[PDB]
Design a protein around this ligand. Structure first.
Ligand SMILES: Cc1ncc(COP(=O)(O)O)c(CN)c1O
Ligand SMILES: Cc1ncc(COP(=O)(O)O)c(CN)c1O
Ligand SMILES: NC[C@@H](N)CCC(=O)O
Lengths: 427, 420
């Protein structure tokens, strides 16, 4: 196993871009700092600039649910780019995706497309405060909603209400209205409300966590957050940028039967192109300009290429047995990893829902970020590297959920398990 | 002039998306409220869903500088997507674009690609504060830097709902082209000013050129108070000149944001400057900023190809040539038809206000006769000309715009203004 070309390109990148990457995690600092430079991806695989081929469990972080470079998506894109990559004006494709999004996810009756999860979340945050007239927001430790200043706050016991910025360059002023609570902790949220009567605009969260490893909501958690927000006329916002169209066609809200007031979407709805969307109830979305006073603009938003890829991707997801397959192969993968971790003597816990999964090197179970933080990062680092050496590309971080696609075959899963066995036996 | 299909699609859109659009301006609220739905765009044209063709002066707001759907860009795109629409990991194409950007603009030694001007600006604002360790920012009224909260300031009070005053408190604003005001701000906030951000040439409150010495003065005082100078060239970058306004006017900022053109139509953005400052950005430094789909291979591809095209000889001279003729023509026609107007142009960027002006700032811009602009806009639309649906938006030309297109556009203007 060698990554000479990646080493070279990455080395040169360090002089051109901060850390040699467009996004922090890509720097592999959580797992050796030796990132892989991709050349191309197809179906369930990715190819190195060195020729290395991997079974991919990142799927460009969600979008590639139907597999990398799906022929139907690229075909639809070929037609779209022919008509121009961007209009800066209304196009019929926006209506189409909008309708699909509306018909697909319960809480969405109207949507505004944007260009990233970060844009979606910062806008949805602004809308929650605009609709309620309240400034305080409740987020959960371990959840990620982009890098808007409000979200860049320190979390954990002792600073849950301190609103301390967790990054230089962000005024305490801006984080002063962001409250955090442990995921899967209803009493923690009730507490935040009581401590701030009439000030909580709402609660935002990943209905199923992927940014602190894979973490599923304990029974009654989503129901509880729904009850508590309704009781205080506060808004419940599901960040389904990652879970949207992956956990289920209707996202976690559809699968678990809990309807929020607003939800953010992304990844899949763009077919690989930068995209994002924030929608929800009609009465709330009407505040978004130019229909309402809450300002939010996106010059290249509703991009025809992004809309086309999103539409084609959803049409594919609409086909029969789609999510049943993702669930099947993924459960197989997940149970396999845990069985292998057990047989090799490694403390581990994990799970999966549809085509999304997690695997922590700790006994767990993992109900929140604090639990996740107990995972053996050194072990994970060696694990990730080993899997890489075995031709398996996993998210370069213990705190990132993995992804499967309709392209992953029964054989891919088994080759992966074989590799996992080989790697864990050597850990 | 029929726009039946546009109306139908738009009406249905208003039930699916706020205002029936993905971005406020597209709703045509300032010019009648009946936007035209595009089906496709080619070269210097836009084609309606009703079969109408328009000589396009919006160029999807900047990206289409080499023309809409340029064959080489679409070909480069079709070839690149075959390898994947996105990696979510490093690819050589990022190094290439980064290098072309670094070589192109005076102040950039290191760059971080993002997905929009908004992300670029909020990120640059954060780096400004992280580098200086200060929170107060100076922005100009009439300048637009995305919808990030700190920018949604009134003129540090919120200008729209949903944004806590607490976050806009650290945002100081001043009239564009007003050095004394900026100076006063620094004095009223000693040791608290992280820096100054602005569009070196304004396009978001109409086309507004900086006065002689303005940019030079801003560089001087920021240096004096150990504060950063940030050029938001998302709109001007690679348009005013290959190196943007900073190159053309010769004033070098410490940091600059980019977008539009660098993505050839695809969602894109970037911020860069001296490596000493840029090294603060994660994962190199402690300042956090991330973008899951940033450095998109398709966006890099289209940006790389778009820049290669711009690097050809006569590119900016051509833009300047046809645009000056367009701008001069408009003002001449306005004069001969008896309408107070003022405008100007620099490269393929221009403005035309229905006000005698002068227009050195937003306040001046607001003196324009919006009613007249609206009727002008509609009439031009009927004459087969598509201008920005706002008096407060600069216009754009592209390499695809022919001498004939300009002739036709001026002829149209004559007809419209003669009817105003
Ligand atoms: C749940 C969630 N919300 C928001 C974001 C921000 O996404 P982007 O990088 O597209 O801004 C992400 C991506 N990590 C996410 O996983
Ligand atoms: C100078 C400038 N800065 C930032 C932006 C924000 O761009 P986007 O919609 O790409 O976020 C714009 C687009 N209006 C701009 O013109
Ligand atoms: N779910 C436990 C929280 N009180 C946070 C612990 C921490 O990370 O400090």
């Amino acid at each position: 196993f060698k990554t000479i070309k990646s080493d070279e390109i990455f080395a040169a990148a360090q002089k051109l871009m901060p850390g040699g990457v467009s996004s922090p995690v890509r720097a592999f600092k959580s797992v050796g700092g030796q990132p892989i430079v991709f050349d191309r991806v197809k179906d369930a695989y990715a190819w190195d600039v060195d020729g290395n081929r991997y079974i991919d469990y990142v799927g460009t972080w969600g979008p590639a649910i139907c597999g990398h470079a799906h022929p139907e998506v690229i075909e639809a894109l070929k037609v779209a780019m022919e008509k121009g990559t961007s209009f800066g004006a209304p196009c019929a494709l926006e209506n189409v995706l909008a309708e699909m999004v509306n018909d697909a996810v319960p809480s969405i009756e109207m949507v505004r497309f944007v260009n990233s999860g970060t844009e979606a979340c910062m806008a949805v945050l602004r809308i929650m405060r605009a609709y309620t007239g309240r400034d305080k927001i409740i987020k959960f430790e371990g959840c990620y909603h982009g890098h808007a200043d409000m979200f860049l706050v320190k979390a954990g016991s002792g600073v849950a209400t301190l609103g301390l910025p967790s990054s230089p360059g962000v005024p305490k002023k801006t984080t002063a209205n962001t409250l955090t609570t442990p995921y899967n902790d209803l009493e923690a949220v009730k507490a935040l409300f009581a401590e701030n009567p009439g000030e909580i605009a709402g609660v935002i969260l990943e209905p199923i966590v992927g940014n602190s490893g894979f973490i599923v909501p304990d029974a009654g958690f989503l129901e509880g957050l729904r009850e508590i927000t309704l009781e205080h006329d506060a808004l419940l916002v599901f960040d389904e940028v990652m879970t949207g169209f992956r956990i289920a066609y209707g996202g976690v809200q559809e699968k678990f039967g809990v309807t929020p007031d607003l939800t953010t979407l992304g990844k899949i709805i763009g077919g690989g192109l930068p995209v994002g969307a924030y929608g929800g109830k009609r009465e709330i979305m009407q505040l978004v300009a130019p229909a309402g006073p809450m300002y939010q603009a996106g010059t290249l938003s509703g991009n025809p290429l992004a809309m086309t890829a999103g539409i084609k991707t959803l049409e594919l997801l609409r086909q029969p047995g789609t999510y049943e397959y993702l669930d099947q192969i993924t459960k197989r993968l997940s149970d396999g990893l845990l069985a292998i971790a057990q047989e090799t003597g490694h403390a581990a816990c994990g799970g999966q829902v549809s085509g999304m999964f997690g695997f922590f090197f700790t006994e767990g179970p993992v109900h929140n970020y604090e639990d996740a933080k107990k995972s053996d990062l050194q072990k994970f680092s060696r694990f990730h590297r080993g899997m890489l050496e075995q031709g398996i590309y996993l998210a370069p971080s213990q705190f990132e959920a993995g992804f499967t696609s309709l392209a992953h075959t029964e054989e891919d899963i088994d080759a992966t398990l074989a590799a996992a066995r080989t790697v864990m036996s050597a850990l």
